[PDB]
Design a protein around this ligand. Structure first.
Ligand SMILES: NC(=O)[C@H]1CCCN(C(=O)[C@H]2CCSc3ccccc32)C1
Ligand SMILES: [Zn+2]
Length: 139
């Protein structure tokens, strides 16, 4: 679990969005596993606007942060799950690091701000949904 809170927006994994997220929907994209809902309170987070390929993510299944080298946002095949059919997920970045399904929502950060959230993983990999291209999150 986990979310990004920036301005009057809450960014979560689309497959973990709540009834309240859908009732306050701003934007969603199944191909990216992202959903953004509106909030009444002002957020605590800053979004990175950069091309970093190194950063630190929070892993809830270890209660620890780990440093990672990650690939640029890309289209990657993701096997079927209870949430989605087998499909290509776009704007996904892969790295070597521990992750389990409940780690989705953990934040990846570089020195500039939030980069993205855990969205895929397994077998010693961890995949992050990028949010740095969503310029409207700042306005
Ligand atoms: N974005 C998706 O389509 C997700 C939906 C939930 C399931 N997905 C995973 O990749 C699982 C694989 C087992 S291990 C694992 C560790 C971390 C995170 C997620 C997973 C795909
Ligand atoms: Zn950066």
């Amino acid at each position: 679990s986990g979310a990004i809170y920036v301005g009057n927006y809450r960014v979560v994994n689309r497959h973990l969005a709540t009834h309240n997220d859908w009732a306050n929907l701003v934007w969603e994209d199944s191909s990216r596993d992202l959903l953004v809902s509106s909030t009444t309170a002002q957020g605590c987070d800053t979004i990175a606007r950069c091309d970093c390929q190194t950063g630190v993510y929070y892993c809830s299944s270890r209660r620890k942060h780990y440093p990672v080298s990650f690939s640029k946002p890309s289209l990657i095949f993701v096997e079927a799950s209870e949430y989605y059919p087998a499909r290509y997920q776009s704007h996904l970045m892969l790295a070597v690091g521990h992750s389990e399904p409940g780690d989705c929502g953990g934040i990846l950060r570089c020195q500039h701000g939030v980069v993205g959230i855990v969205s895929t993983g397994g077998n010693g990999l961890v995949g992050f949904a990028d949010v740095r291209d969503l310029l409207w999150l700042d306005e």
